[PDB]
Each structure stands twice: as structure tokens, then as C-alpha cells.
Amino acid sequence: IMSKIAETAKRLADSLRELRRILEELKEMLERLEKRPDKKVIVDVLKVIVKAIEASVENQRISASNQAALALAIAAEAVKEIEEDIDRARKLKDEGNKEEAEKVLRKAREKIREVRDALDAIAKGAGTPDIALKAAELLVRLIKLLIEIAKLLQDAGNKEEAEKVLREATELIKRVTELLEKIAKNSDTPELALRAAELLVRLIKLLIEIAKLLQEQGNKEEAEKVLREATKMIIRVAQLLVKIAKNSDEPELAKRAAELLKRLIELLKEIAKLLEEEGNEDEAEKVKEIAKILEEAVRELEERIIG
Amino acid sequence: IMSKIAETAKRLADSLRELRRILEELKEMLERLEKRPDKKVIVDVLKVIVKAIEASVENQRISASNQAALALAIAAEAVKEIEEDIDRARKLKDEGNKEEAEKVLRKAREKIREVRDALDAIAKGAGTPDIALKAAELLVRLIKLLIEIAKLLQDAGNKEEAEKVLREATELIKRVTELLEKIAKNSDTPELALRAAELLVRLIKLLIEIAKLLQEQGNKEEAEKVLREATKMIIRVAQLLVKIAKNSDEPELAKRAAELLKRLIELLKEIAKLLEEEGNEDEAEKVKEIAKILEEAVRELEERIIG
Amino acid sequence: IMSKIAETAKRLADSLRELRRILEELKEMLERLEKRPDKKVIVDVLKVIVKAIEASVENQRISASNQAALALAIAAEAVKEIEEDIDRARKLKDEGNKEEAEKVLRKAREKIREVRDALDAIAKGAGTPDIALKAAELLVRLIKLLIEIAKLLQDAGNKEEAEKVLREATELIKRVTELLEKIAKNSDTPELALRAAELLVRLIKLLIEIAKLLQEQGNKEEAEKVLREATKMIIRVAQLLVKIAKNSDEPELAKRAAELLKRLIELLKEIAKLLEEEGNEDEAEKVKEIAKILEEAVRELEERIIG
């Protein structure tokens, strides 16, 4: 993040230098038009006015990008503040103040919503897709922090309070998932699509930890629905992972997709294990059936790794 | 604050898009002027140049507003750093290092002055008044943190050091009060004036806690002057609160002004109680006389609530 | 830093106001050109277009400067996060988790590299030299935090891991030193050159603490090279300090250079003391010879202080 603050600052410094140069050439065209005007000489003068505004627009573009990088760093500090207050509320539950920790967690939830609204805004207006991925990488941390909040509520006994929190993280995962899918779809390089796939693999594991926590509350009826969203997302990611490795600039992008495709298999095992504990063994064996589909997909990738 | 970073970023993204569109229309006018020039056709071309610069000015406006939101978030993190170092210096007084805590508090005081200089600057150049209110909301926290500093100095025995700190927060309250009064005076909507009134009610309570702390030091001669500023400010706020509730867009703005007007009464009770402890019972009964004025003002508001 | 956020915001607010005024004068020139055009009247109209873009360029300049100040504050918070994690890893070594602290220190090292890349970028594109000095002041803290990391590695027994860290801080000191030398060379006022000299005196002491830590590991062969860079840097700084005090706007700048020149002498004593422990007493007496050169340089400065 701090390195993206560096790049956006260096590129902003270049555009501002060229904008200052195009300003001096704008004033030289004032001299060229002060000596003698003409009907067609003005055309070449407006060429500088256009180059002046376009140099200003590009500077205001990178300036907005540098502010985005500064906004991503402030948002990262906001997540760390929430994490400190979560561990603080965790300390309160362990120390004995289980009642006061519920006020610290309701603060962090309003904080998480506020950092979410910023990160989602930073993701939409992202001239560079790395701004969106870094924003999604922090939105992922907000979701995992939302899961850690619900586990403290469940540990404190506020199971009804934790379900709504888990339902909120469930809706946050889908929103970030759709953003990550757009980044991967529109990814010009295979590296950016793989970075979105690494976060998508995490959003599935977050979706799994929600399901197990939903099972611990007793809401085995909704953890089924949540596992249906994780199993669906794994299929999309696997489609993406197989496509990234098929059209591989470097073979290192295929092996990393092979590692992630193994993770989709492993995460699919826990889904079937959790579906077994829910009693839905029929849908669990179908989940294992998808795992054997992905296993074959990983196996054929390792063959291209050697062949 | 993080939500204001979102709004300013989204509005910046829109202005930058329209600035890029007005750039392409600027280059289309280069084509329209390359084919054939004229004496009056140039007029409509400059219309785009004006729309190009105005689209750039508005983008540089929202960009400055987004930087202000980023500056308000960095300032909020600065207040939290000061608060951690205050609680740290509080731990040092409780642990035994009352001598080293005085260096931590002198650091935080120089920090508070620096965050104050930024927040006051952010308040002046606020294209949106919410930038100024959020800035005032953090300047309020700086003042309460300045009060907590002086109480640690008083608890550590540095009564002479705490008075100057309390005199510094007294001068900070007036500065933020004048800003809050300008925001409420110039408030287009009753919501913004009520938000300034909520902070004004806090600045009075801060001014009261300074007075009691000034009484604990023995400077009952200056706590009188400080209570004279709190009693004056309550009158101004009550004038504002009664006016906000009179011209109420929603009746919910009147009840909140009724709650605050009750707080002005309660805060006025402590002023008379502190003036009683100072011995100025004559000015204390006059303070109770203002409380009965506000009580009647609250009562008539509740009648309009029902009538 | 927060005060520089204030100044850059206030100056940005002024440029944006004048940019809005020059926008209205741009639209008045649209009226002046709508009534009647001419061949030479257009010249004075383009004068406003030039003043409009130049008012926009200066606003985009201060806007980039305000973002730099916001980037310097975010970088300062990043150093404080690294320092908290260093003290945390220090707690882990004292508590017993010497193995897990090595993962916290490798995180902080990647953090230090990232804050370094930003601060170095902020230093290059610094319209105001105070942006570069504040950036160098934080890069100095990154180096001292890098030294505290290596001492924990040495205390944990990872001497081979600490040497590379110390070699990394050694290369960081030179980079910041060259920046500080450029700031002092190009300093218009003697105050800015003295501020660079105060950090240069610290980079030498950091370079000394690296040498002693390199001696504690046993790498007395490289601490010699490091002390050769500190002894060289002291000569450059002393040349700078004597020149700053010679051409002194205020005499207070000479006494502060006298204090720093004493520090260069003291730091030169430890170099000779460390070179004595390394066995290089021959180069150590030559280091004392430079100390007596600086002593005479300080003595002659105190004579001008009185004469």
C-alpha cells in the first residue's frame, strides 16, 4: 500500500512537471500570437491549449489516484484500529467484562461499515486496478474481522446478535466477490486475475468459517445456504483458475493456480464435512463430486507443467 | 469520517469523468475549428474551453474536499495516538513513573497544538460544512484530552502546569465555539445547526470540567471567569436551540433540541453548584434563574410537540 | 507534520479561491468576446486563459503538496505501527516467544522497506524542501528502527540475520545522507541546512550504533568499513556546519552548529574507541586527529560568538 503511495506520487510528480512545461509552452504561444495573428495559426495554438488541459486532466487523474492510495492506507490503519478494539473486546471477555465488550463490538461494527463504504467507493473509482484489489484485500480483512466479532458474540452467548453479524459478512463477501470477479474478468495481465483469485479463495474460506459459526449457533438452516454460496463461488473461481493457468504468460502463474485449485478442493472438503454434520450427506457427496472434478482439473494442469 | 472519504471520492470520480468527457469535446472542437474558422464560430468553441476549465475547477474543488476528508481521518488517528499516550502517561502515574509521564504529557500537548492547527485549517477551507463540523468534533476531543492531561498534572501535583493547560483548553473552546456558531448561523438545514449545538453543549460541559478542575487547584478566581463563559455560551446555544425547534423541518429536530435544552439546564445546575462551592451564591442564584428561563423554554417546546 | 498539513491546506484553499475567481473572469471574457470580436482583442482574452491554467497549475501544485503532507503523516503512523510491532517482538523475546518474534521482525522489515519507498518518493517530488526534510526525518526513524530490529536479532542469536539488516540500514543511511546533503547544498535559508545537519549528525550516530552492533556480532571487518563511512560523513557535516555558522543570519544558528560540531567530536570519540576495540589503533589516532581538527573549528566559532 505504501509502495502504491510511492508510485502514484512519482507519477503525479511527472505529470505536474509536464503540466508546468506545457504551461510555459502555453505562454510561448501567447508570444507567438502577440507578434502576429492569423486564421490558421490559431489552430496550432489551440493544440497547446488542448495539450495544456490534457496535461492537467492527467495530473488530476493521478492526483485522484494518489488520494486513493492515501485513502487505502488510511483504511488499512482503520482496520488495524478495529482489530485492536476486537482483541481489546476479546480481552474484556477473557478478563470478565463480557457486557462492556458488546459496546466495543457494536462500535467496531459501525467502524467496519464505515471503512467498507470507503473501500467500496475507492474500488469503484479506481483508475488503476491495483487500487481496487488493495481495496478488496482490506474489505476481506473487514469480513474476517466481522467473523471474529461474531465468534466473540457467540462466545459471549449473543448468538442472535452474531447471526446478523454473520449475515452482514455474508452480504459483504458477495459484494467483494462480484468486484473480484469483475477485476479478474477485465484483468489485462494474468497476475491481476490470480491476485483476485487468491482473495476469492479467502472469501470462500471466510464463507466457510461463517457456516461453521452458523452451525455452532444452531442456524444449520442458513449455513446450508451459505455453503451453497461457497460451493458456487468455488466453481466460478475454479473456472477462473483453470483459465488463468491455460493462458499462462509464465508457468509460475499455473503452479500458483494449481496451489489455489488444491485449496478449493480442501475448502470443498470442509463444506462436505460441515454438510455431513448438518445431515445433508446427499448434498455433501455432490460437493465431494465437485472436488473430484477439480482434482482432475488440477491433475491435468500438473501434466501441462511437465508437458 | 471514513464515509465522508467515500462521498468525496465518489463525487471526485464523477467530476473527473465529466472532465475527461469535456476534454474529448475540447478535442472535437479542435476538429470543428480545423475544418473552417469563423469570427462567431469561435464563440461556441470557447464555451467548451470554459466548460473544460470549470469541469477542472470543480474537480480540483472536490479533490481538495477529498484531501480534507483524508486530513480529517489522519487527524482522528492523531487524536487516538494522543489518547493512547495519555492513558500511557496515566499508567505511568499509577505505576509510579509520575516524573516520566510529565514528558509524555508535554509531548501530547505539542501534539494537540499540531492537530489543532490542522483541524482549524481544515475548518476554514471547508467547501462542505460537514468537513468543518467533523473538524470541530475532533477539536472537541482535543480539548477533552487537554482536560484529561491537566487532571493528570493535578493528580501528579503539577497544579501550576495544569492551570496553563486548562487556560489553553479554555481558549480552544472559545475558538471552536465561534466556529460552531458560524456553522449554525450559516446552516442551510436544521440538521447541521443541531449537530453544531450538540458539540456546543459538549464545549460547555468541557468548560464546566475545566472550572471544577480549576476549583480543585484552588484557582477559584479563574473558574468564576470560566463559568461566566459557560453560562454565556449556554444562553447563545439556548437561543439557537429554541430557534432550531421553532423552525423544524421534522419534529424530531425539536425533541433533540428539547433534550439538549434539558442538558443546558443540567449543566447550568452544576455551574450554580460550583459557584456555590466558590461562595458566589449571588451569581449562583442568577444562574438558577437562567435555568428556570430555559425550563420554561423547554416546557413551551413540549407543548408544540403535542400541539 | 500536522502543521504542514495545515499550511498546505491553507495555501491550497487560497489557490482554489483564486482559481475560482480566474474562472469567473474567464466567463466575463466570454461576454467581452460575445459582444464583438477582434484580431488583437483576443490577445488580452488569452491572457486570462493563461492566468486560468496557471491558477489551476499552482492549485494542482499545492494539492500535490498537501497530498505529500498527508503522505508524510500516514508514513509517520506507519513508523509508529512498526515501532509498536518492534516493542511487541521485543516483548516476545522477553516473554519467551523468540521464534515468533522473528516473523514479526520480518514483517516490520518489509514494512520498513515499503515506508522507505514512499518517503523516498515523497522526498524526490518535494515542491517545498520541508516535505523532503520531514521525509528524511522519518527515514531516519526507519533506520533506527532497523537498528533496533537487528539488536533483537542479535539478542535472539540471529547474528547472520542481523548483519544483513545492518547492511540494509547502512545502505539506507547513505541514501538519506545524499538527500540531506542535497537539501543542505540547495538550502536557501541557513535554518534548513542546519535541520539537515541535525539529521546528518543522527545518521552518523546511527552508523556508529551499527558499527558497535557489527562488533558485537564479530563482523569487525565490516564495522571498520562502516566507521569509515561515519568518519567521512562527519567531515562533510563539519564542512557544512562551519559554513552554516560562518554565514549566519542569526547568531543562534552558529551556536546550534557549535553544539552539533561538539556532537561530531563526541561521535568521533566513540569511533576511535570502537576502532580501538577493533585493534585499528592507528586509524583510531587518525580519527582523534580529526576530532582535534573539529575542536579547533568549534573553538574558532566560539571566538566569533564573542567577537
Side-chain angles (χ1 to χ4, degrees), chain A residues 1-34 37 39 41-45 47-94 96-97 100-102 104-219 221-307, chain B residues 1-34 37 39 41-45 47-94 96-97 100-102 104-219 221-307, chain C residues 1-34 37 39 41-45 47-94 96-97 100-102 104-219 221-307:
Chain A
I1 312 179
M2 219 64 203
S3 301
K4 282 301 137 179
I5 298 184
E7 178 218 311
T8 52
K10 289 301 299 172
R11 300 309 183 276
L12 177 62
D14 301 330
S15 60
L16 195 55
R17 261 179 167 84
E18 299 175 352
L19 178 57
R20 287 213 58 85
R21 188 200 75 89
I22 208 68
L23 175 75
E24 302 301 314
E25 200 170 11
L26 185 83
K27 292 180 289 185
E28 177 162 346
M29 292 311 183
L30 175 139
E31 164 208 320
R32 285 193 125 273
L33 205 52
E34 178 173 20
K39 219 185 300 181
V41 166
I42 279 184
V43 174
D44 307 322
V45 178
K47 151 202 191 71
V48 170
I49 296 182
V50 170
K51 281 192 290 185
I53 296 186
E54 187 155 19
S56 172
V57 169
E58 291 301 315
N59 187 84
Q60 299 182 43
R61 266 171 48 98
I62 312 174
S63 184
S65 181
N66 195 27
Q67 298 172 36
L70 299 176
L72 286 183
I74 295 171
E77 303 292 331
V79 180
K80 284 142 189 172
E81 176 197 10
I82 298 168
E83 197 176 21
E84 281 185 343
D85 284 60
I86 287 175
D87 192 21
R88 221 171 264 164
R90 175 182 309 180
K91 181 181 74 174
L92 300 196
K93 176 187 54 57
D94 297 359
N97 271 30
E100 259 300 322
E102 208 158 340
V104 185
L105 293 182
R106 291 175 203 269
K107 287 179 240 172
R109 223 204 310 181
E110 189 192 1
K111 290 180 178 178
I112 287 174
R113 293 186 183 95
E114 288 165 11
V115 190
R116 165 211 62 183
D117 296 330
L119 289 167
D120 274 296
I122 302 161
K124 303 289 177 295
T128 75
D130 214 13
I131 289 176
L133 265 175
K134 296 279 196 303
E137 193 168 6
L138 290 175
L139 276 170
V140 164
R141 288 203 153 107
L142 287 182
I143 298 171
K144 179 49 190 161
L145 288 195
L146 209 52
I147 296 176
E148 288 191 314
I149 284 180
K151 198 186 191 311
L152 298 187
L153 300 174
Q154 165 186 307
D155 290 354
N158 311 116
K159 300 171 178 175
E160 199 185 8
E161 297 276 332
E163 171 268 314
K164 304 154 187 174
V165 169
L166 288 180
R167 197 120 195 179
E168 197 150 26
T170 298
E171 197 181 324
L172 245 187
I173 288 172
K174 292 147 49 188
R175 290 280 155 85
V176 183
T177 292
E178 191 166 26
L179 179 79
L180 290 173
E181 287 175 0
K182 292 179 181 180
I183 298 171
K185 271 180 53 181
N186 311 330
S187 61
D188 304 323
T189 192
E191 167 208 338
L192 288 175
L194 203 49
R195 287 182 47 81
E198 296 166 50
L199 289 175
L200 280 168
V201 168
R202 299 177 194 272
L203 287 184
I204 295 159
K205 193 184 191 318
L206 296 184
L207 211 48
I208 285 178
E209 298 191 36
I210 293 182
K212 180 188 179 180
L213 287 192
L214 283 176
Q215 284 186 197
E216 295 200 61
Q217 300 180 17
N219 251 320
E221 45 272 18
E222 265 73 45
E224 245 164 290
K225 319 298 192 303
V226 169
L227 288 175
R228 275 144 60 168
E229 305 194 334
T231 305
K232 270 196 60 182
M233 278 174 49
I234 288 191
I235 299 178
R236 300 147 164 171
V237 177
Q239 296 175 17
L240 184 76
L241 286 176
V242 172
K243 290 171 192 181
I244 294 170
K246 276 179 187 160
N247 322 81
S248 54
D249 174 28
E250 284 205 31
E252 300 184 348
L253 300 164
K255 280 159 284 299
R256 186 143 64 116
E259 301 169 8
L260 295 174
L261 266 168
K262 293 173 187 173
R263 252 299 169 181
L264 294 189
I265 298 164
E266 255 57 50
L267 295 179
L268 217 44
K269 305 263 188 55
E270 269 111 309
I271 295 177
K273 196 86 182 70
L274 291 179
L275 284 170
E276 269 193 288
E277 301 162 4
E278 289 171 2
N280 309 82
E281 95 190 52
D282 46 63
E283 294 288 340
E285 281 112 35
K286 304 170 183 180
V287 161
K288 307 171 192 173
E289 288 168 9
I290 310 164
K292 300 212 62 182
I293 294 175
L294 296 200
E295 265 156 339
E296 173 66 31
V298 186
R299 298 190 232 108
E300 274 228 337
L301 260 52
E302 308 243 27
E303 174 260 336
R304 253 286 182 171
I305 293 303
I306 313 178
Chain B
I1 312 179
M2 219 64 203
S3 301
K4 282 301 137 179
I5 298 184
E7 178 218 311
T8 52
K10 289 301 299 172
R11 300 309 183 276
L12 177 62
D14 301 330
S15 60
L16 195 55
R17 261 179 167 84
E18 299 175 352
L19 178 57
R20 287 213 58 85
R21 188 200 75 89
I22 208 68
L23 175 75
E24 302 301 314
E25 200 170 11
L26 185 83
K27 292 180 289 185
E28 177 162 346
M29 292 311 183
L30 175 139
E31 164 208 320
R32 285 193 125 273
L33 205 52
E34 178 173 20
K39 219 185 300 181
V41 166
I42 279 184
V43 174
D44 307 322
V45 178
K47 151 202 191 71
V48 170
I49 296 182
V50 170
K51 281 192 290 185
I53 296 186
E54 187 155 19
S56 172
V57 169
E58 291 301 315
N59 187 84
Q60 299 182 43
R61 266 171 48 98
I62 312 174
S63 184
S65 181
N66 195 27
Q67 298 172 36
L70 299 176
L72 286 183
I74 295 171
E77 303 292 331
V79 180
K80 284 142 189 172
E81 176 197 10
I82 298 168
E83 197 176 21
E84 281 185 343
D85 284 60
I86 287 175
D87 192 21
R88 221 171 264 164
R90 175 182 309 180
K91 181 181 74 174
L92 300 196
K93 176 187 54 57
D94 297 359
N97 271 30
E100 259 300 322
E102 208 158 340
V104 185
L105 293 182
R106 291 175 203 269
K107 287 179 240 172
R109 223 204 310 181
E110 189 192 1
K111 290 180 178 178
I112 287 174
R113 293 186 183 95
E114 288 165 11
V115 190
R116 165 211 62 183
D117 296 330
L119 289 167
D120 274 296
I122 302 161
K124 303 289 177 295
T128 75
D130 214 13
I131 289 176
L133 265 175
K134 296 279 196 303
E137 193 168 6
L138 290 175
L139 276 170
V140 164
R141 288 203 153 107
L142 287 182
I143 298 171
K144 179 49 190 161
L145 288 195
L146 209 52
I147 296 176
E148 288 191 314
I149 284 180
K151 198 186 191 311
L152 298 187
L153 300 174
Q154 165 186 307
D155 290 354
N158 311 116
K159 300 171 178 175
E160 199 185 8
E161 297 276 332
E163 171 268 314
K164 304 154 187 174
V165 169
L166 288 180
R167 197 120 195 179
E168 197 150 26
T170 298
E171 197 181 324
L172 245 187
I173 288 172
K174 292 147 49 188
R175 290 280 155 85
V176 183
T177 292
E178 191 166 26
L179 179 79
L180 290 173
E181 287 175 0
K182 292 179 181 180
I183 298 171
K185 271 180 53 181
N186 311 330
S187 61
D188 304 323
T189 192
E191 167 208 338
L192 288 175
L194 203 49
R195 287 182 47 81
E198 296 166 50
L199 289 175
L200 280 168
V201 168
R202 299 177 194 272
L203 287 184
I204 295 159
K205 193 184 191 318
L206 296 184
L207 211 48
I208 285 178
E209 298 191 36
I210 293 182
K212 180 188 179 180
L213 287 192
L214 283 176
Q215 284 186 197
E216 295 200 61
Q217 300 180 17
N219 251 320
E221 45 272 18
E222 265 73 45
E224 245 164 290
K225 319 298 192 303
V226 169
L227 288 175
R228 275 144 60 168
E229 305 194 334
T231 305
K232 270 196 60 182
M233 278 174 49
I234 288 191
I235 299 178
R236 300 147 164 171
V237 177
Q239 296 175 17
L240 184 76
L241 286 176
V242 172
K243 290 171 192 181
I244 294 170
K246 276 179 187 160
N247 322 81
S248 54
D249 174 28
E250 284 205 31
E252 300 184 348
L253 300 164
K255 280 159 284 299
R256 186 143 64 116
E259 301 169 8
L260 295 174
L261 266 168
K262 293 173 187 173
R263 252 299 169 181
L264 294 189
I265 298 164
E266 255 57 50
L267 295 179
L268 217 44
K269 305 263 188 55
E270 269 111 309
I271 295 177
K273 196 86 182 70
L274 291 179
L275 284 170
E276 269 193 288
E277 301 162 4
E278 289 171 2
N280 309 82
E281 95 190 52
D282 46 63
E283 294 288 340
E285 281 112 35
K286 304 170 183 180
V287 161
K288 307 171 192 173
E289 288 168 9
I290 310 164
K292 300 212 62 182
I293 294 175
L294 296 200
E295 265 156 339
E296 173 66 31
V298 186
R299 298 190 232 108
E300 274 228 337
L301 260 52
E302 308 243 27
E303 174 260 336
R304 253 286 182 171
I305 293 303
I306 313 178
Chain C
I1 312 179
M2 219 64 203
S3 301
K4 282 301 137 179
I5 298 184
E7 178 218 311
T8 52
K10 289 301 299 172
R11 300 309 183 276
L12 177 62
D14 301 330
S15 60
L16 195 55
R17 261 179 167 84
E18 299 175 352
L19 178 57
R20 287 213 58 85
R21 188 200 75 89
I22 208 68
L23 175 75
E24 302 301 314
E25 200 170 11
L26 185 83
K27 292 180 289 185
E28 177 162 346
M29 292 311 183
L30 175 139
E31 164 208 320
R32 285 193 125 273
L33 205 52
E34 178 173 20
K39 219 185 300 181
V41 166
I42 279 184
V43 174
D44 307 322
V45 178
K47 151 202 191 71
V48 170
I49 296 182
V50 170
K51 281 192 290 185
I53 296 186
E54 187 155 19
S56 172
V57 169
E58 291 301 315
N59 187 84
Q60 299 182 43
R61 266 171 48 98
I62 312 174
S63 184
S65 181
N66 195 27
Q67 298 172 36
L70 299 176
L72 286 183
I74 295 171
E77 303 292 331
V79 180
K80 284 142 189 172
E81 176 197 10
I82 298 168
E83 197 176 21
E84 281 185 343
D85 284 60
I86 287 175
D87 192 21
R88 221 171 264 164
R90 175 182 309 180
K91 181 181 74 174
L92 300 196
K93 176 187 54 57
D94 297 359
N97 271 30
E100 259 300 322
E102 208 158 340
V104 185
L105 293 182
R106 291 175 203 269
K107 287 179 240 172
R109 223 204 310 181
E110 189 192 1
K111 290 180 178 178
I112 287 174
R113 293 186 183 95
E114 288 165 11
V115 190
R116 165 211 62 183
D117 296 330
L119 289 167
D120 274 296
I122 302 161
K124 303 289 177 295
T128 75
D130 214 13
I131 289 176
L133 265 175
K134 296 279 196 303
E137 193 168 6
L138 290 175
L139 276 170
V140 164
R141 288 203 153 107
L142 287 182
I143 298 171
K144 179 49 190 161
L145 288 195
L146 209 52
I147 296 176
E148 288 191 314
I149 284 180
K151 198 186 191 311
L152 298 187
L153 300 174
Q154 165 186 307
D155 290 354
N158 311 116
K159 300 171 178 175
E160 199 185 8
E161 297 276 332
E163 171 268 314
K164 304 154 187 174
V165 169
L166 288 180
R167 197 120 195 179
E168 197 150 26
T170 298
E171 197 181 324
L172 245 187
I173 288 172
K174 292 147 49 188
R175 290 280 155 85
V176 183
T177 292
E178 191 166 26
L179 179 79
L180 290 173
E181 287 175 0
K182 292 179 181 180
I183 298 171
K185 271 180 53 181
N186 311 330
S187 61
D188 304 323
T189 192
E191 167 208 338
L192 288 175
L194 203 49
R195 287 182 47 81
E198 296 166 50
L199 289 175
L200 280 168
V201 168
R202 299 177 194 272
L203 287 184
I204 295 159
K205 193 184 191 318
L206 296 184
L207 211 48
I208 285 178
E209 298 191 36
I210 293 182
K212 180 188 179 180
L213 287 192
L214 283 176
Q215 284 186 197
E216 295 200 61
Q217 300 180 17
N219 251 320
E221 45 272 18
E222 265 73 45
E224 245 164 290
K225 319 298 192 303
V226 169
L227 288 175
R228 275 144 60 168
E229 305 194 334
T231 305
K232 270 196 60 182
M233 278 174 49
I234 288 191
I235 299 178
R236 300 147 164 171
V237 177
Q239 296 175 17
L240 184 76
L241 286 176
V242 172
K243 290 171 192 181
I244 294 170
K246 276 179 187 160
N247 322 81
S248 54
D249 174 28
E250 284 205 31
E252 300 184 348
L253 300 164
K255 280 159 284 299
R256 186 143 64 116
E259 301 169 8
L260 295 174
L261 266 168
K262 293 173 187 173
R263 252 299 169 181
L264 294 189
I265 298 164
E266 255 57 50
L267 295 179
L268 217 44
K269 305 263 188 55
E270 269 111 309
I271 295 177
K273 196 86 182 70
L274 291 179
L275 284 170
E276 269 193 288
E277 301 162 4
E278 289 171 2
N280 309 82
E281 95 190 52
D282 46 63
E283 294 288 340
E285 281 112 35
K286 304 170 183 180
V287 161
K288 307 171 192 173
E289 288 168 9
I290 310 164
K292 300 212 62 182
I293 294 175
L294 296 199
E295 265 156 339
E296 173 66 31
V298 186
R299 298 190 232 108
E300 274 228 337
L301 260 52
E302 308 243 27
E303 174 260 336
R304 253 286 182 171
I305 293 303
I306 313 178

